[PDB]
Amino acid sequence: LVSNLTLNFGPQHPAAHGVLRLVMELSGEMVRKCDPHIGLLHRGTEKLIEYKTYLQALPYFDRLDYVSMMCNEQAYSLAVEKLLNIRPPPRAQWIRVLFGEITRLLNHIMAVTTHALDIGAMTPFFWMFEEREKMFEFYERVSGARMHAAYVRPGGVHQDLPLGLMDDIYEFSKNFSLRIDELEEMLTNNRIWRNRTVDIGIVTAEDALNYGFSGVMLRGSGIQWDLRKTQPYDVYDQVEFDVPIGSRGDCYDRYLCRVEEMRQSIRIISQCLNKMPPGEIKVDDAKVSPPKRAEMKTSMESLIHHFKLYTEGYQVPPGATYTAIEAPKGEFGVYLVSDGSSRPYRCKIKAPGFAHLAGLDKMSKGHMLADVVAIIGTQDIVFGEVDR
Amino acid sequence: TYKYVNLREPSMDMKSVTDRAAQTLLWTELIRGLGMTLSYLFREPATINYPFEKGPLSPRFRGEHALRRYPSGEERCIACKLCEAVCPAQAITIEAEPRADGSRRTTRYDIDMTKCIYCGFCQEACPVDAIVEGPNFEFSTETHEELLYNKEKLLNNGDKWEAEIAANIQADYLYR
Amino acid sequence: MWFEVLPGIAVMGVCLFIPGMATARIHRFSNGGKEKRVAHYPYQWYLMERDRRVSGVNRSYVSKGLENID
Amino acid sequence: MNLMLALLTNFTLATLLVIIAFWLPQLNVYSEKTSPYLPFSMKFFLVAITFLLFDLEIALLLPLPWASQTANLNTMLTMALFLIILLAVSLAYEWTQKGLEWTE
Amino acid sequence: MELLQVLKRGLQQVSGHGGLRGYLRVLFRANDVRVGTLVGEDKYGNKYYEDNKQFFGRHRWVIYTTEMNGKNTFWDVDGSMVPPEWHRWLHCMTDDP
Amino acid sequence: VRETFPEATIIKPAEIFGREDRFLNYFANIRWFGGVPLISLGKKTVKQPVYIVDVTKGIINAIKDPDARGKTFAFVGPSRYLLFDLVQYVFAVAHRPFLPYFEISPFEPWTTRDKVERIHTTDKILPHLPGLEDLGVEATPLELKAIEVLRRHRTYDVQPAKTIP
Amino acid sequence: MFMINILMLIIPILLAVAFLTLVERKVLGYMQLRKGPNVVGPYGLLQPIADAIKLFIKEPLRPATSSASMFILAPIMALGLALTMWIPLPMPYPLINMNLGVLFMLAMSSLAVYSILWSGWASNSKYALIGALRAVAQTISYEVTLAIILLSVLLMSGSFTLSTLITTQEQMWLILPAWPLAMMWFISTLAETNRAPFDLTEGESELVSGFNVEYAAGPFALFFMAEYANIIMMNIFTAILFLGTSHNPHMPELYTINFTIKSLLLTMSFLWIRASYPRFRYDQLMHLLWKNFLPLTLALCMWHVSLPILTSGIPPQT
Amino acid sequence: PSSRGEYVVAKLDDLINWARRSSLWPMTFGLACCAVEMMHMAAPRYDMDRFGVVFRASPRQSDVMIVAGTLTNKMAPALRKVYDQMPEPRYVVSMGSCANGGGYYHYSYSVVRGCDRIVPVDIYVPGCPPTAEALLYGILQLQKKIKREKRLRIWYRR
Ligand SMILES: CCCCCCCCCCCCCCCCCC(=O)OC[C@H](COP(=O)(O)OCCN)OC(=O)CCCCCCCCCCCCCCCCC
Ligand code: SF4
Ligand code: SF4
Ligand code: SF4
């Protein structure tokens, strides 16, 4: 400890992931100890949900990982369906998988662009954020909200895709692969980019597993693991894609796992615009998913359900469950107890960042100060999920 | 399935090495990045000239809450308090009494717009299409109190946007 | 379009053009439409001194000729 | 006399804008404000010294363009080349003996 | 040739607005001197042009009235000056004006 | 006011001192820059300054008390002082040199002619006027609430003044 | 008459600096796929004026500097030097014809590191001072390459006179036989002027407080103006060295127009680069100098010393 | 031409107000989701920079603070500390529901129920989150507000 610095992100640089107050110890330029202080964005989400019905609680999940909106909703929905012992219909499962990979595009565009922003490479941020816009419109037209949809729900989705949407989604996918090449042409082979990333933040396979790392923080270390291919949930047992794998387990690989994954999604989206079946989009069980308006305004048996399902909510059998999904950042998952009534008794959330951030100290040992910038970004941290 | 994203073993023949040497000593790769940017300098920027132009939306868009009327003129809300019971943020406050003619109607209807999360659950729950989220998204105010809508402020939005709220539902109610 | 950048470039270009243009004309104005004499070495400064004496008007840019041979 | 004037105008104007921009903004009465609230790294010191020496050895080379105009070129070229060669040894010696730590 | 042909479109945007003073007036009120089909007009004086050769987002635009509800809006326009009927068309929420 | 509103309360406070006040700050600033202490006969002036918070509590208690109708109050510090002592005490806190022995301008006149007149005037002693303690308020010694006022003036063992009992 | 000439040289500079900020903010946008300033005035042509008015009228902060004496000297030094660098430049006629013009410019820029040191040496922050040094340790480091690379070229020109560099390139540009130097000379100008990807001061503001953070709105507009003044000068200096334009004594304005265009293109390339690469970590921008540029720069210095002698290409001393 | 003092003063007030309103240099507190929308206003489609609103400005060079996102108690003290360091004139824009009134998390123990409890706000942009265009309107609302000030006139009549 030559001198300790309490590096605070008060003047939040354009990161859009929260503010981190970091407490460090520089033995000159090296970092002998890095200590994160996180609670700045703890709002009490895990305790508010105790007072909300299972439906009312859903919007909270768009607000944990606010760059992976629909992905979160899928995790919460899968958990509840599993508790309710019901299966959504195939068309919904395809829409959810369709958007689950569109969101992954939104998230990885955020991670790479900002991570490249914190290191001064600014131009790629604008180019790719013009693709996010067009990707929001798809979010916009199916739910009405640019960012926070609440579209996915226990028992399927809310509304069906408006006519002519998939024509646009196909059009968007057709041109996108050129966009990435416009990006890799900047960062992939650029010597400056390699200098800031090569052999930085190396994590051994054995340590990653113990430290709880998941997602691209594993596959960078050469581990072959991705919940989609190993514990598939909706349809992922019906799509051909290859899981990228790292070699040296440093920043540059994790930059290539993410860029590579963004391609593999265009390989999945392409498949979901072809295999999408006709049918309805919510479980045909009017005690869980509310009935159509036209039937609500005509039939008594339906009117009652539209009443209870929007005031008391739908009970849930008592039980506990841990459900996780390969969210873009890592292994997002929720341990959710249920006491039998309409309000969950407890909702623990396993934010992927929370595990990674603990490992920040480990990865920053024997690294210069400016590497702590790169290390935080490569973990793809958003402090909505970390603090909750 | 899987695939190695970085497992190359560059050939060490003289031509191969000279290429890498030619790359380092002359900044070839760095130049190639400059080429890409130089192309964007000659493409039409994606900037819309707001306010004279507006970023496209869709009929489902969620904006300022508003209260509708039947074609006759009567109010649609019947103080069923379903919107109040599902609003996740509890931003809706309803207080109703039998009306002077015996009808069931509200007396207090405040939508605190600083606790609303624009979820849209209110209109999903209303059984008579009374409380709906208009398409207006430009109502930022200069004081906090102006965002605490009361019933009089909600209807006026209804009697001000009905020429568009009505059109949108016609366009989209089928998906509901 | 991209050409709308040009007015900013052109306006700056004028600001960069004035310093060169002003000095060129200013030198001509003083030196009677001749490049200002350059005297890097005493020989040059020596001649530029004699020329002033020969001018007869205390000005070194008034270059006399054979008309002064008399 | 010109350059004496040129510097004076180049610097007198610098003073104005400094004082103009330091005082007159003060004469605008923006209420008043309350009271809002080193380690010696060796590597830093070296690069100062490292450049310091290399700067002197540069001082010897500045007259080179005039040198090449002498008749005794064989001597000129050698001593001209001798210095630059040593200036590489100085860099090599520090480099070889791990003297460029700050580069890290 | 094309480069020369561009200069034609540049001038046709002066006659398009009807004279230089017309050209400048939009140039400073709207910062854009495009010319498009007059899809219509509203009672408050707003004029909703359009051009279908422009990329989706810029085809449809408006030029707010120089006076509304007894207030001078020669410079002080804002996005809440579009009556609801046009408000739906200008946002591409629908296709029929 | 008394003729117009016979029930109106009236308050007679001392020279109040506080964070943004214009009494203690007046000494610290005007003197320092390009100025030498121009104390005109600082040994013939007696000051009994009062705290801004202390005045504030009285006014609030003035509203609440039903017996404060028509009466005239006088707020004064716990201790009188000699003008010279305070000014040295100020500079003592401000850590600035002490050297005992700016016209009216547009904008905001600083160092006005009359303001110099008002400092010389002495604190009246009026035992017949009910004081702060008649409201339940307690005065605050200037010793405690002087550092926080003058802390900012300081750049990056010190004795208080002498009262006048 | 002379005072007119100086003012008609200082004043155009200040205007050009102001409208370089306009051009910069627009060229980036179109490379970033957006228009940039096009509202204030027509095509943003008044955007700089609103900036200058806004900054100056803005309230200045309370520096609380331990040393107020130096806190004023720094901007005076920085802004005076930035302007002083332009008096020896021929365009094509220098304001003050200097025989040692090159040395006058080279020596003057070296003094500029004081403003980068006095400011941080009065900020009164244990962190800003550290950040201030790093900035100084970068400027001085690269000035070594500047001098050597600059010296090598003079071997092919034969004198320190700037207006003589025009003559050396009468038959061709100097970029031709010296392009390895130009590659490094250009970069040495970026690092010296503290530009991207070497602009550590601005990039590392959070981690290590920058030296100029404490300066207020008014003064900041001086330091910022000084920097952008140098950028133009260096590029003008670059174009003069390597892209010299043939000089016609009958029609000098032709030279000025062409010389201006070359200078403008170079300046834009400074803006083009900013929007193309990430930033260099501090140690790496040092590794570049000592271990990559410095060895090569020495090697070329010998090569350019040898070359005129062996090829009998020794330029005249005068 | 004989120009009355009020007329001469009046015009100046318009000039400075034009300068301040035409060149706002914001500071963003990207506390939560609403920060992402704030970015999209810097994205190419809306390109806030063209109005004069530069993307990033340090705390001491800023003119307007944008409190985009939630404000937990732990983070409140640093908010004020940053605010007080803003050289005047300084305008605060509250963006989102969690900053206007504590939004979704209004009743939580560790939430500050609006930044207006902690600083004086000038504009309230509603929505969770406001569309990037909704916020851009909020900025263009402030510029008009700065255009209606009478700083000189008030001074002239004191
Ligand atoms: C017969 C006689 C023969 C005599 C001549 C023989 C020699 C000629 C052939 C050799 C010429 C060599 C040219 C020397 C220039 C320096 C090139 C160089 O080596 O730079 C290397 C530097 C770091 O090296 P690195 O890539 O990290 O490799 C690992 C090493 N351990 O990597 C870098 O360079 C970093 C680059 C930083 C700048 C990048 C940002 C700017 C790039 C865009 C500008 C491009 C240049 C524009 C030119 C403008 C001209 C005005
Ligand atoms: S949109 Fe949702 S949160 Fe807002 S008022 Fe309606 S139901 Fe309540
Ligand atoms: S708005 Fe609709 S849901 Fe709410 S009380 Fe009225 S009728 Fe019932
Ligand atoms: S206001 Fe909306 S976007 Fe902002 S933090 Fe709250 S929920 Fe998220």
CA distance G305 to G155: 7
The three state secondary structure string of chain G is CHHHHHHHHHHHHHHHHHHHHHHHHHHHHHHCCCCCCCCCCHHHCCHHHHHHHHHHHCCCCCCCCCCHHHHHHHHHHHHHHHHHCCCCCCCCCCCCCCCCHHHHHHHHHHHHHHHHHHCCCCCCCHHHHHHHHHHHHHHHHHHHHHHHHHHHHHHHHCCCCHHHHHHHCCCCCCCHHHHHHHHHHHHHHHHHCCCCCCCHHHHCCCCCCCCCCCCCHHHHHHHHHHHHHHHHHHHHHHHHHHCCCCCCCCCHHHHHHHHHHHHHHHHHHHHHHHCCCCCCCHHHHHHHHHHHHHHHHHHHHHHHHHHHHHCCCCCCCC
Q: Determine the Cα–Cα distance for residues A380 and A71; give it in Å rounded to an integer.
A: 15
How far, in Å, CA of A214 to CA of H117, rounded? 40
**Which sign, positive or negative, has the C-alpha torsion G60, G62, G64, G68?**
positive
**What is the torsional sign of CA E15, E19, E23, E29?**
negative
Query: Which region, left, alpha or beta, applies to residue H120 given φ > 0 means left and ψ of -120 to 50 means alpha?
Result: beta
Q: How many C-beta atoms surround the C-beta of residue D34 within 10 A?
A: 11
Relative to beta strand E47-48, strand E40-41 is antiparallel
Residue C35: domain span: 1-70
Q: How far apart are CA A294 and CA B127, in angstroms?
A: 10
- B79 marked as part of a ligand binding site: no
* Cα-only R_g, chain A: 22
- In this structure, the residues whose C-beta lies within 6 A of any atom of ligand 4 are A 63; B 117; H 32-34, 69-70, 96-98, 103-104, 128-129
B80 marked as part of a ligand binding site: yes
Joined together, the tokens standing for residue G64 give 């609380």
Strand H91-95, strand H123-125: pairing: parallel
Among D37, D40, D41, D43, the strongest candidate for a mutation testing the A interface, having the largest count of A CBs within 10 A, is: D41
Query: Which of B67, B70, B76, B78, when mutated, tests ligand 3's pocket best, judged by the most ligand atoms within 8 Å of its CB?
Result: B78
State how far Cα A81 lies from the chain centre: 20
Tell me if B30 CB under 6 Å of ligand 1: yes
Name every chain F residue with its beta carbon within 8 A of the beta carbon of D22: none
Across the beta sheet with B104-112, the strand order is: B92-98, B104-112, B148-149
The first and second tokens of residue F72, run together, are 């005239």
Domain extent, residue D24, equals 7-96
Residue D30 lies inside a defined structural domain of this protein: yes
Does residue D48 form part of some domain? Answer: yes
CB A247 within 8 A of CB B7: yes
DSSP 8-state assignment for residue B115:
T
Residues from chain H contacting residue D24 (CB–CB below 8 Å): none
**Specified resolution (Å):** 3.6
Q: What's the rounded Cα separation, in Å, for the pair G248 and G250?
A: 5
Ligand 3 pocket check for B92: Cβ under 6 Å: no
Q: Cβ of A100: how many Cβ atoms within 10 Å?
A: 28
- Say which residues have a Cβ less than 8 Å from residue E50's Cβ, sequence separation at least 6: E36, E37, E39, E59, E60, E61
- Ligand (nearest to CA of B83): 3
Residues in G closer than 8 angstroms to A13, CB to CB, are 206
**Nearest residue by C-alpha to atom 7 in ligand 4:** H128
CA distance A235 to F84: 88
Residue of H87, H7, D21, D26 whose CA lies nearest to F107: D26
User: Within its chain, how far is the Cα of G69 from the centroid?
Assistant: 27
> CA angle, E15 as apex, E14 and E21 as ends, to 5°?
60
Helix (H) or strand (E) holding F93: helix F83-94
A186 and B36 within 8 Å at the Cβ level: the answer is yes
How many C-beta neighbours within 10 Å does residue C59 have? 13
Contacts of D25 in chain H (CB under 8 A): none
Side-chain-side CA neighbours of D2 within 13 Å: the count stands at 13
Helix (H, G, I), strand (E, B) or coil at F101: coil
Token pair in block for residue E54: 């422009």
Are D97 and D74 in contact, with CB atoms under 8 Å apart? no
Q: List beta partners, residue B148.
A: B112
Neighboring chain C residues of G22 at a CB cutoff of 8 Å: 8, 12
What is the CA B41 to chain-centroid distance, rounded? 32
Tell me which DSSP letter residue C17 carries. H
Of A43, A44, A33, A38, nearest to A17 by C-alpha is A38
Search chain F and give the residue with CA nearest D27: F107
Q: Which two tokens stand for residue G80?
A: 């005076």
Protein residue whose Cα sits closest to atom 31 of ligand 1 = G292
Q: Which residue has the tokens 């530029």?
A: C48
* Ligand nearest, relative to CA of residue A189: 1
* A231: DSSP letter: S
Residue G242's beta-bridge partner residues? none
Measured CA to CA, the distance from residue A292 to residue A300 in angstroms comes to: 13
| Cα separation values, B45 from A122, E92, H37, Å | 17, 20, 20
Six-digit token string for H124:
């309230």
Enumerate the β-bridge partners of residue B94. Answer: B109
* CA B100/CA B96 separation, integer angstroms: 12
Do A15 and H28 make contact, defined as CB atoms within 8 angstroms?
no
Q: Tell me how far apart the alpha carbons of residues E83 and E62 are, in angstroms, rounded to a whole number.
A: 12
Shortest alpha-carbon distance between residue B83 and chain G (Å): 43
CA atoms within 13 A on the CB side of E80: 17
The residues near G224 (Cβ < 8 Å, ≥ 6 apart) are none
d(CA G234, CA G190): 9
Q: What is the DSSP letter of F135?
A: G
Query: Which 3 state secondary structure label does DSSP give E13?
Result: helix
Cβ atoms of A166 and G71 closer than 8 Å:
no
> What torsion do the CA atoms of A71, A75, A76, A77 make, to the nearest 10 degrees?
90
Phi, psi dihedral angles at A337 (to 5 degrees): -85, 160
Residue A338 identity (one-letter amino acid): S
User: Residue D29 and residue F20: Cβ atoms within 8 Å?
Assistant: no
In whole angstroms, what is the distance from residue A246 CA to residue A224 CA?
Answer: 9
Please name which ligand lies nearest the alpha carbon of G181. 1
If you measure CA to CA, which chain A residue comes closest to G288? A192
Distance from CA of H36 to the nearest CA of E (A): 21
- What's the domain count of chain C? 1
E76 closest CB neighbour out of H45, H137, H144: H144
To 10 degrees, the CA torsion angle through A54, A60, A62, A68? -100
Among G145, G187, G243, say which to mutate for ligand 1: greatest number of ligand atoms within 8 Å of CB: G187
- Ligand 3 neighbour B83 (Cβ under 6 A): yes
Number of domain units in chain D: 1
| Pairwise CA distance, residues E88 & B168, whole Å | 9
Spatial distance between the Cα atoms of B9 and B23, rounded to a whole number of angstroms: 17
Distance CA F24, CA F93 (A): 11
Task: Say what angle helices A69-84 and A90-117 make with each other, to 10 degrees.
Answer: 140
| Torsion angles phi and psi, residue B120, rounded to 5 | 100, 5
- Option in E32, E55, E80 nearest B52 (CB): E32
Residue F163: strand, helix, or coil: strand
- Return the number of other C-beta atoms located less than 10 Å from residue A329's C-beta: 27
CATH number at residue D59: 1.20.58.1610
Alpha helices in D1-104 (DSSP H): 2-23, 42-61, 64-67, 73-96
Q: Does residue D103 lie within any of the structural domains? A: no
Which stretches of chain E are DSSP H helices?
2-16, 20-29, 84-90
Residue D101, in any domain of the structure: no
DSSP string computed for chain H: ----HHHHHHHHHHHHHHHHHH---EEEEE-STHHHHHHHHHSTTT-GGGGT--S---GGG-SEEEEES--BGGGHHHHHHHHHTSPSS-EEEEESHHHHS-GGGTT-TTB-S-GGGTS--SEEE-SSSPPHHHHHHHHHHHHHHHHT--HHHHHHT-
Residues with CB under 6 A from ligand 2: B 65, 87-89, 91-92, 111, 116-122
Task: Please check whether residue C1 touches B, CB under 8 A.
Answer: yes
Residue F7, judged by CB atoms within 10 A of its CB (0-12, 13-18, 19+), counts as: exposed
The SS3 of residue F43 is: coil
